[PDB]
Design a protein around this ligand. Sequence first.
Ligand SMILES: Nc1ncnc2c1ncn2[C@@H]1O[C@H](COP(=O)(O)OP(=O)(O)O)[C@@H](O)[C@H]1O
Ligand SMILES: Nc1ncnc2c1ncn2[C@@H]1O[C@H](COP(=O)(O)OP(=O)(O)O)[C@@H](O)[C@H]1O
Ligand SMILES: [Mg+2]
Ligand SMILES: [Mg+2]
Lengths: 257, 235, 259, 190, 46
Amino acid sequence: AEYKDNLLGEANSFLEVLEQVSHLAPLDKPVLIIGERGTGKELIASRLHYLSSRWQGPFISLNCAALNENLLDSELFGHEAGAFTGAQKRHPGRFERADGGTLFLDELATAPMMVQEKLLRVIEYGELERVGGSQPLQVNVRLVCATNADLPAMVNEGTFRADLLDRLAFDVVQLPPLRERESDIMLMAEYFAIQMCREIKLPLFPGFTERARETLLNYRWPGNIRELKNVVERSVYRHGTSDYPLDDIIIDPFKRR
Amino acid sequence: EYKDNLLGEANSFLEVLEQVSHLAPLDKPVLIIGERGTGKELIASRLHYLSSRWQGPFISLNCAALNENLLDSELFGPGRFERADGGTLFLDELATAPMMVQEKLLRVIEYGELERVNVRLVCATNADLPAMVNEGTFRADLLDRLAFDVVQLPPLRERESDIMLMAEYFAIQMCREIKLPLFPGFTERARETLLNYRWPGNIRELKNVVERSVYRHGTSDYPLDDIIIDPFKRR
Amino acid sequence: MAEYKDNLLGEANSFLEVLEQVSHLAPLDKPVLIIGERGTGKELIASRLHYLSSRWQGPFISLNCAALNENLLDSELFGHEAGAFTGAQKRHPGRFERADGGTLFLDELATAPMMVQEKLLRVIEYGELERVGGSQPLQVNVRLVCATNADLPAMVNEGTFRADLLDRLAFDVVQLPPLRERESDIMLMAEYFAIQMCREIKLPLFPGFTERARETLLNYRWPGNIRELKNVVERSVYRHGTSDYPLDDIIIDPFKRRP
Amino acid sequence: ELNADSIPRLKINQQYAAMGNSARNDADGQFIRSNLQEARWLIKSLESRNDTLLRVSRCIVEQQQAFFEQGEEYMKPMVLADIAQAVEMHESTISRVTTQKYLHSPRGIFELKYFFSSHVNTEGGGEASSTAIRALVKKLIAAENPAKPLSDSKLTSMLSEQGIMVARRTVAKYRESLSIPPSNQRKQLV
Amino acid sequence: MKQGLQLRLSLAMTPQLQQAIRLLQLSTLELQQELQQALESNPLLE
DNA sequence: AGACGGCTGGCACGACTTTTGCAATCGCAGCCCT
DNA sequence: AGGGCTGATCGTGCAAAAGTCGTGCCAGCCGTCT
Ligand SMILES: Nc1ncnc2c1ncn2[C@@H]1O[C@H](COP(=O)(O)OP(=O)(O)O)[C@@H](O)[C@H]1O
Ligand SMILES: Nc1ncnc2c1ncn2[C@@H]1O[C@H](COP(=O)(O)OP(=O)(O)O)[C@@H](O)[C@H]1O
Ligand SMILES: [Mg+2]
Ligand SMILES: [Mg+2]
């Protein structure tokens, strides 16, 4: 398909990252994304998958960290047929999604050491994670990683095997810090404001006060998009009817009065 | 009129009530930032009575000890949201729900076919949902969608001037219930004891303490003197 | 009786003699244990052993060692005859039962459960096993393949590995020449990997390697025997242009800081 | 919806049930009870079969809407297991349902089994229905210069321009299915 | 997951009746002939 | 006028289809054999 | 007088062997240009 870069970073670093992504898109190898909390890494990975030659069939961004147990993540990687009884969902579907597709995960540091070893064994062979009483199926699948934690830090911790870290890390995508980016931050903020003014169907766009924009820039805003969207929603809830430029930030539910 | 349960004379309480009324005219989800006791069920009952569609049925869903088979039964594969009809069922203990359960509930709201409803929504949690998401204890998409508009609630410590009015109303209600002739009155000692009480619970604790004090007194002749919530007391 | 040499690379060092010894030991069906280079090459050794084994000898059953905390592993090893053990309630054959006359490619994962190793000791005791809830035992025959990545005697002295586990296994030890020790086919293996990468990327022509790159490779520690070098070659090819001025620019790995 | 006229319906004989319930003879009453049990089982089986067929047809249409609306060219490559996954019944039940069943729609009358088609690898990663591929091949072949008929290799290249991933042997088989003549035979004087 | 036995509560060999029922749904016009044949034998079905 | 080429048709092999062939264990008790 | 044991009633699948196609692949041949 075609990569979607709506509200792409105006910073030249974002453009260089996009150029590297375009270069690697014809290739078929794992990628590591050094991101931050709400930095936009997974959206960048999805855009790369869109640009990754064909549409690459199914695209799944399941995160092992946001799972009840590591056993559930292993079942998602591969479900042995007849093992245990019952399930919350068809576990083999997650494995089948990578078939004719790529592998995308978020916060891979939380993955169990046994799970990491099983994944490393699968990646080299390509076979299905769970045999289920039969020979595992080698599905043609790519891979992508996105963890804020440093891979060398994990190697020092020893949670990930040396082979796992090496073969897993084929491409590195270092997401620029949200606080560090200023021009890209302003461009993205303007794009988000326009998109909100359109979606919220407000008759007139309030715009943005210079003091309000300066205060927003002064905020650390680690969530390049997540915190940005949260602050946009906080300002939208305090709807000024296109006449109040205060842009009060009510994103923090704990904050009151 | 719903008898105006928990009449909050505080300007903040009035603003919260106005925001709740505005949310009630809408049939869209909203978040209620309040804790058990602090989030008195009387407020939720008044909100339900203030439903935009009076014909609309409200189920007022809450966390229950339902097994996995019971969890599927609560789902269509008969849906739980089907019990309510155009009403904001005030979900309770949403932090206690399972991650799979939370995802299933979120998919039921403005979503479909998450794995490869004619009713409003309401929820309230005593825990820090942003912290739990930062701790990875809840679905970020569910937290974001549910928190369309967070409606904070005042705790017992928040109500200071209205505390006296609430105590008077509770005493009147107890006198009506306990067949007391009227409110015998308070004393400076009783008021000081009530003020010094940190009141960890807001609604249920106040009513329970009032009931215990009334049982201790049991008369409408002598005005109230003092009360305590300790395990034991003596002269 | 087929060659199936596959991507058997890096034999210019004493690895040729290691391969000769492996070929000599191939006809025997006794226990097979190796010592693979830490980080890379154990899979290549296993593939070479499988090629040494007859293609019609049997399936090449490979299992990554895991602790006994997962009852599924116990069911795979011992079997599952009764209900609630594995698969259906019937006699779902385990992984060991799945291998009848085939190679048992063991992994030296150094799993925490010594109980798992103790159970595996009975797996190869007289060629027999009993399933979970198995009313009658079953005598089975299968080939065994093992490897290592650490000092077995050190763990034996330290008690990390069961003494009986080492005694029963390791009929003979096969040592992998280290990458810091082989150092012979670095040019040849690097050229083969570069050719494969160029074919994969559809590179018009071979770019060529500067002498400075060869000197750096000689100075490189190369923790991985045949995988880290291949990964470095792939990373360099990604950052280089075939038959162009960018060919000089070589990237060791994305993990290293950008230039 | 199932054709109301076509679906058979059975009704329990109320007079017979009343006679059997009040039958003076114990043997006659027992025989009536056995007959009633058999008839009830048959009626329940027929109703369940009709309902299962309706549900299977609805599920099939859910995935074949593209072919239903756009036409034969937009036919998704689907298998029996694909339909079995969307329902709770097995592929055996799918085969039993997809047995001598014809459904009428705005497009026309088509057999239930005609929906299922082979999966063909294609450029862009997707898979195509062999029926749709044959339809496209026939459309291309018909719209050709009569003086110079298209070669099967040439047709294969043309379809590869759309991502055939076919070696023209399957194209040859499809042409045989459509009775396409040879390139030499197709050519004629202008 | 965790090893265990039945701790809370929660199949069939279809005989000739249900077996022929499964053998049904093969056709519709032909199914009518078999249905008439059965209705001839069964005296409590109309 | 013997070779190029495209067709066609035979051949084979894993991967989708499918069909038929099974018909488990269960609590009553009175009657017949010992 | 005590043991054997007799038939009532029950049940929308599947799986296992078989078949069977999708696709590719080889062998020849004739229309033709050389
Ligand atoms: N270049 C971009 N243009 C438009 N939107 C973007 C861009 N990058 C990120 N986003 C937005 O940021 C949101 C969050 O992205 P991301 O942080 O990658 O997801 P996750 O929370 O899974 O990491 C997405 O919904 C996406 O719309
Ligand atoms: N001649 C060769 N042929 C094929 N692969 C090789 C060769 N030399 C090195 N390798 C690579 O070295 C790697 C060794 O990995 P492995 O030994 O499994 O790691 P670990 O020892 O950490 O388990 C293999 O993935 C293989 O691709
Ligand atoms: Mg994310
Ligand atoms: Mg390894």
